[PDB]
Amino acid sequence: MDIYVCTVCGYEYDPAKGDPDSGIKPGTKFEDLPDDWACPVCGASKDAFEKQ
Ligand SMILES: [Fe+3]
C-alpha cells in the first residue's frame, strides 16, 4: 500500500483508492501502474512520482 507523491503538484497516488478514471482499480500498487499513467491533477508522468 506504499503511497507515492507527484513531485510536480503534490497529488498523492494512494493504492487503496487506485485511479478509476485511468482504468486503475482500487488496490493497484504504484509499480503496477502502466508507464503511460499520468497525474490526474497536473498531467505529469508516472515517473515524476516519488515514495511519500
Ligand atoms: Fe501532479
Side-chain angles (χ1 to χ4, degrees):
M1 279 280 156
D2 288 351
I3 297 166
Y4 280 69
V5 184
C6 181
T7 61
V8 175
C9 75
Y11 167 87
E12 292 177 21
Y13 180 75
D14 178 0
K17 304 319 182 169
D19 179 28
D21 289 345
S22 298
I24 307 302
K25 246 171 170 175
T28 303
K29 291 167 46 119
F30 176 83
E31 67 265 32
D32 287 297
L33 296 169
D35 195 53
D36 72 351
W37 182 82
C39 179
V41 173
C42 76
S45 169
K46 181 186 175 180
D47 301 308
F49 283 66
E50 68 180 6
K51 189 216 42 177
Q52 174 188 85

